[PDB]
Amino acid sequence: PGTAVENINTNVKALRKLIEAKQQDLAVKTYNPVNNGASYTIELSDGTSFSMYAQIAALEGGGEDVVYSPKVGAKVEHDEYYWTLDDVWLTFENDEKVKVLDENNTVAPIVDINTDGYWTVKYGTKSRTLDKAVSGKLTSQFKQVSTIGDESVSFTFTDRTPVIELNLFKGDNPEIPPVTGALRRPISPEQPAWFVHIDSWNYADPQKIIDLIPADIRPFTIFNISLSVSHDEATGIYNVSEYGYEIAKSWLRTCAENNVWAMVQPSSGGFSHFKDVSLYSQFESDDKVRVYDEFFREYPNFLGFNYCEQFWGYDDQFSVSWLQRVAHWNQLLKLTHKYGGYLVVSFCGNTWSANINPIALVKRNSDFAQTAKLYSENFIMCEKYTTQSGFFNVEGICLGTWLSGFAGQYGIRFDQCGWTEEKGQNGDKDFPPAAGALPIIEHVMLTGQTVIDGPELIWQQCFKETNAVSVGDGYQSRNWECFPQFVNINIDMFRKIIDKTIRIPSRKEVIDRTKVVILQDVYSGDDNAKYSSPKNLHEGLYLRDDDGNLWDNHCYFKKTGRYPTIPVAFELCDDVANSFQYKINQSTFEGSWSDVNTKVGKFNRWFPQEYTGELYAGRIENGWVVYNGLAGIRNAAIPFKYNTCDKMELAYSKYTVSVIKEYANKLTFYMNNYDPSGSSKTEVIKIYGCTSKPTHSVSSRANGTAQVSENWKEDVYTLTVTHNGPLDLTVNCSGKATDRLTVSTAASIQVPASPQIYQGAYQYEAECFDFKNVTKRVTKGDSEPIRNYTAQGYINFGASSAAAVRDAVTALEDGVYTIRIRYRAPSATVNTVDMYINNTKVGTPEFAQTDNDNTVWNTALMSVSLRKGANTFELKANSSGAGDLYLDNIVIERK
Numbered sequence: 001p002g003t004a005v006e007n008i009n010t011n012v013k014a015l016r017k018l019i020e021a022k023q024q025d026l027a028v029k030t031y032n033p034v035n036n037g038a039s040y041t042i043e044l045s046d047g048t049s050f051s052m053y054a055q056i057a058a059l060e061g062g063g064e065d066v067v068y069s070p071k072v073g074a075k076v077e078h079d080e081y082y083w084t085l086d087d088v089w090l091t092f093e094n095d096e097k098v099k100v101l102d103e104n105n106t107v108a109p110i111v112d113i114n115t116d117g118y119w120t121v122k123y124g125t126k127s128r129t130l131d132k133a134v135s136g137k138l139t140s141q142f143k144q145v146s147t148i149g150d151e152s153v154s155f156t157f158t159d160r161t162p163v164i165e166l167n168l169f170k171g172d173n174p175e176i177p178p179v180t181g182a183l184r185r186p187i188s189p190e191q192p193a194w195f196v197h198i199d200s201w202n203y204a205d206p207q208k209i210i211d212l213i214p215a216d217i218r219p220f221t222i223f224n225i226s227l228s229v230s231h232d233e234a235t236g237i238y239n240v241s242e243y244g245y246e247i248a249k250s251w252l253r254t255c256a257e258n259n260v261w262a263m264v265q266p267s268s269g270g271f272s273h274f275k276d277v278s279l280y281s282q283f284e285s286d287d288k289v290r291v292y293d294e295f296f297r298e299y300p301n302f303l304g305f306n307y308c309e310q311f312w313g314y315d316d317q318f319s320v321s322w323l324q325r326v327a328h329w330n331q332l333l334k335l336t337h338k339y340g341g342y343l344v345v346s347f348c349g350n351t352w353s354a355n356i357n358p359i360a361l362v363k364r365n366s367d368f369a370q371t372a373k374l375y376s377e378n379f380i381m382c383e384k385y386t387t388q389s390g391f392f393n394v395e396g397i398c399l400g401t402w403l404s405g406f407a408g409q410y411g412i413r414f415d416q417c418g419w420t421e422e423k424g425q426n427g428d429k430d431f432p433p434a435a436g437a438l439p440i441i442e443h444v445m446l447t448g449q450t451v452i453d454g455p456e457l458i459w460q461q462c463f464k465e466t467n468a469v470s471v472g473d474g475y476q477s478r479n480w481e482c483f484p485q486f487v488n489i490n491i492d493m494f495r496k497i498i499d500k501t502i503r504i505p506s507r508k509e510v511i512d513r514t515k516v517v518i519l520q521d522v523y524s525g526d527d528n529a530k531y532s533s534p535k536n537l538h539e540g541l542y543l544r545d546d547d548g549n550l551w552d553n554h555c556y557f558k559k560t561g562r563y564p565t566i567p568v569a570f571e572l573c574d575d576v577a578n579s580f581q582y583k584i585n586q587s588t589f590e591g592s593w594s595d596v597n598t599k600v601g602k603f604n605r606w607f608p609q610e611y612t613g614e615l616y617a618g619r620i621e622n623g624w625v626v627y628n629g630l631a632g633i634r635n636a637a638i639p640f641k642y643n644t645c646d647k648m649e650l651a652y653s654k655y656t657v658s659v660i661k662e663y664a665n666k667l668t669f670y671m672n673n674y675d676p677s678g679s680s681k682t683e684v685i686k687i688y689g690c691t692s693k694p695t696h697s698v699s700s701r702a703n704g705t706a707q708v709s710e711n712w713k714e715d716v717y718t719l720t721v722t723h724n725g726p727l728d729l730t731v732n733c734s735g736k737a738t739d740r741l742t743v744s745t746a747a748s749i750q751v752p753a754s755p756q757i758y759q760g761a762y763q764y765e766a767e768c769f770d771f772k773n774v775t776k777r778v779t780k781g782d783s784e785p786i787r788n789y790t791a792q793g794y795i796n797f798g799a800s801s802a803a804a805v806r807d808a809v810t811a812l813e814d815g816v817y818t819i820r821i822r823y824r825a826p827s828a829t830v831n832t833v834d835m836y837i838n839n840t841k842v843g844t845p846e847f848a849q850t851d852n853d854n855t856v857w858n859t860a861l862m863s864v865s866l867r868k869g870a871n872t873f874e875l876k877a878n879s880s881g882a883g884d885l886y887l888d889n890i891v892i893e894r895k
């Protein structure tokens, strides 16, 4: 959006305002570069906010060269600023100069193109025609804003307009010391984490996504503030998340206010809202990258940055090389470590991205490798299921990153998108949500994942905005709901972690179960040879008969669980890593292990057979993950290792997953197969070798249905389980065996502590206010003409006598607060809107007429008493407005 001419005039009006701010000694309160400094937002101390453009939109019509455009600058003579045109005095008729500040006029010279295609400049009733305007790229009259010492802020221009220096606002409240040192929010088997997205694509009200997470889950949740990298190809400008900084800031404040942990996700490919660094020093001394230190310093609940699907979109005009991104991570991990945060990376692969996978990450970047090793506690590596192939290759490597000591936690970011295009799997073209439970439960339980991220797509599998709903007193409000699969698969699965059914193994427990690791020591050949796992590594182990090797591996369901996920690492960094029983150098792999039959033989000696059948069954201690990844009813015969009976025989429907806990005289089964459309599945369970009549009991979970029939005949107990969705089934069954293992003491789950209380300003977006009788609600601002808003939109409150907005705000304590209302009133002052706090009128804000420009906002202040806890904010028209009133947000702050 936004034309050349609008950009040009925006800068003219900015110049006037800067010169007025100079003379009135206004300070710059804040400034922020956007789209890599293509533009900046400026806030002054009087509440005026506006944009300046270092880059100008091309003049329509598709010229490719740099062409002329009028440069309206300003120069001082005899103590006063006068306007320039292309570095000569701007004159009209008189040859008389025109003063920037005249107090008569409030209108700056306006640049335009007339009907004959000539540039024009107008001031008052006076007009001058300049050169023909030809289509092409233009240059700005404005260069950059930057900070000098830490006293001052300098605006620089491209045309001999002198530097304009303004004071930087020395703030009046005392500094809140940040959380530093220890991890802010420890993650472990005892304290798993779910990264739940507050997503730009849901156009979220952060408060409403937060409140969709039930109370028992919230303390284990880390809210992932997700900025989309959707952008215009030609200019680089972000659309969906036009203002990343502003989105992240607003949603992080809401998180902080809610006392919930949060991260920001500024990057999907190479693409990022925030500039990459090369030197640690930049975090404090470079005004282009303030965001990194700011979020850590100001929000004790902030944990850090999430760089997702780091496999694509490098070396674009508007992104960095992958090498640059790693050098960024090298410094950011240091910053992260200081503040006790996490840097999260996720990876999904293809054949072209071998040289940027988690092996290459450390094997090609020795400096990063060193930092990673030193600060591993602060670094989290996640397998992502977004691509079409290589699932086992990428699983093994992401696991290897953790087990080898380069990453301190291992996670999964599951995604519907990894369902094979066209044909799907098992004859199912469309992705069935039930499929998604299988890798998550398997990799958590058997490979020690402490982080679950998503699942994706957030806006299809997790949350959706509905139409507005009534909320009382004539107001409506935006509404979000959970997708049924989120409740019936993801929330319920996490509860099964919390309730100790699904015990997560520690790194050391995983290493001892896994036994074997491949070390990627190959420096000859192509990128796959040097960074990917051996082609045929999974063949004849857990690769399905209908699926192929490496980049022909299109299915993430394992054929058997006899063999652990096979980790692949670069190097083993610490003594724990070096305790692996079997170390295979990949350079020897083609020699010995590439012959499938030879490998299966040696693996079959290391890993004994503990069941038979076509189901996936894998065992850790007294716990089994058993699932059906194939079409049709599939079966397993599993001798008991802890239960005193003999064996269980299982017959499971397609996509039925189960976690089975063995006890001496008891079995539990967590079972799920959730279909949103309500189909019923049949499973069968047979226990052999009972020495008395068993009993059972069952409870459906979430929105699930179940019915269980039992049968005792000969010495065989059969349970037939009809269900949709999740259930817990208990079987009380004992036999004679004395040669059984002993169940461990109950595992530890520790509800993670809350963050430190946030002492800062709270923010509330108008586009999230409850409303009635407003002109327009802009929930997606990028397509509309107003710039320089916060979060993803704003509203046009409009001029109706019946117009009103409401919101629920909070206060830590009773006392006096400033409410800053960020508004626009572009055609006349508005004095017909009253503010209510807790259903009592507290005053009439002075919505003073603002400049016409598309970039200009201002702020009206009000002091009120709030009480501790929940308060009601309202703005209500009492009569027709003299003009339209736009609202962006309110900011509430202790006075």
Ligand SMILES: O[C@@H]1[C@@H](O)[C@H](O[C@@H]2[C@@H](O)[C@H](O[C@@H]3CO[C@@H](O[C@@H]4CO[C@@H](O)[C@H](O)[C@H]4O)[C@H](O)[C@H]3O)OC[C@H]2O)OC[C@H]1O
Pocket (backbone or CB within 6 Å): 228, 229, 230, 231, 268, 309, 312, 313, 350, 352, 386, 387
């Ligand atoms: O709306 C936005 C989405 O369009 C955007 O989607 C990305 C998607 O574009 C990305 O696709 C990757 C692109 O890279 C390919 O690899 C290339 C293949 O050709 C080679 O010659 C080249 O060297 C190589 O890099 C991958 O095949 C392909 O999967 O996947 C991720 C997805 O998020 O994302 C942002 C949205 O806002």
Ligand SMILES: OC[C@@H]1O[C@@H](O)[C@H](O)[C@H]1O
Pocket (backbone or CB within 6 Å): 226, 227, 228, 229, 230, 268, 308, 309, 456
């Ligand atoms: O627009 C970027 C998308 O949002 C992120 O959360 C996803 O992983 C990426 O695919």
Ligand SMILES: [Ca+2]
Pocket (backbone or CB within 6 Å): 765, 766, 767, 789, 790, 791, 792, 793, 794, 887, 888, 889
């Ligand atoms: Ca807003």
